């Protein structure tokens, strides 16, 4: 089974997921100075007022937060979208150094962490299916570097004790995902995939310039998480990132100058 180690990491996994290699796979680095700006690129329009959270949960390769997708409660609309795209949940991906655990980079640079957003388009009816399609997925990327920390995070990290290991799951209603966004929704976008298996090339990226800063600590408590079961040697949830991947035939382009 896939994984991030030696013997199951991201070099492996054009072998059960054979579009691993495929012409639209993600991350990528995003080179700021080719990336075009294009004037025609609407602002992203974030409607996160009703967003209904219900569980996080420890899936082995990450944490998620879930939400309520069976009504227009948290939507992502505009940008390069057509149509009205709805929140599943978010995760993240980090490092075991500060230096390392973004999947996107920027001109090559790594952030400590990045967050996924993830949403489908409602003319899909299900993400089952809208996995199935080219335009089935948007996915909000937000990168995190240490600094100061992220209020709005701190009700995520300190839950993290009661999942640290694969399967564990609990109840996270209430929480606002506004309390994770940056000033700014400048953004570069792309076509793209999911970054782990299946791998699908399903996802519009959308990947905002600004990061939002986080504490060490609230770090720190990422990287006590485990991938292992409760009861199997102990191996810490670090290094959840698969790299960069060619563009091939790809052109990113910036909503900003
Ligand atoms: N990391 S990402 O590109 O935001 C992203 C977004 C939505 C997703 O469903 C995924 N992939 C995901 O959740 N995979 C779960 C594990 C799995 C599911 C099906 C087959 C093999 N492995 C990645
Ligand atoms: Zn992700």
Redesign the pocket.
């Known amino acids: 089974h896939?994984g991030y180690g030696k013997h199951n990491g991201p070099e492996h996994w054009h072998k059960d997921f054979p579009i691993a290699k495929g012409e639209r796979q993600?991350p990528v680095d995003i080179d700021t100075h080719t990336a075009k700006y294009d004037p025609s690129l609407k602002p992203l329009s974030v409607s996160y007022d009703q967003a209904t959270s219900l569980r996080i949960l420890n899936?082995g390769?990450s944490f998620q937060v879930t939400f309520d997708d069976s009504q227009d409660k948290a939507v992502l609309k505009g940008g390069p979208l057509d149509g009205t795209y709805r929140l599943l949940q978010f995760?993240f991906?980090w490092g075991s150094l500060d230096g390392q655990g973004s999947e996107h980079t920027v001109d090559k640079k790594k952030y400590a962490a990045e967050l996924?957003l993830?949403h489908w388009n409602t003319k899909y009816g299900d993400v089952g299916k809208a996995?199935q399609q080219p335009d089935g997925?948007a996915?909000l990327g937000i990168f995190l570097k240490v600094g100061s920390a992220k209020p709005g995070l701190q009700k995520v990290v300190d839950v993290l004790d009661s999942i640290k290991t694969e399967g564990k799951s609990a109840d996270f209603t209430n929480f606002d995902p506004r309390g994770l966004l940056p000033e700014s929704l400048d953004y570069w976008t792309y076509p793209g995939?999911?970054?782990?298996?299946?791998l699908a090339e399903c996802?519009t990226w959308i990947v905002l310039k600004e990061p939002i800063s986080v504490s060490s600590e609230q770090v720190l408590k990422f990287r006590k998480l485990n991938f292992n079961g409760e009861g199997e040697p102990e191996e810490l949830m670090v290094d959840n990132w698969r790299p960069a991947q060619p563009l091939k035939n790809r052109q990113i382009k910036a909503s900003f100058k």
Not at 193 to 198: A, D, I, M, N, V
């Open positions: 896939w993600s899936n390769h995760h991906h996924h993830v996995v997925l996915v995939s999911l970054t782990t298996p299946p996802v």
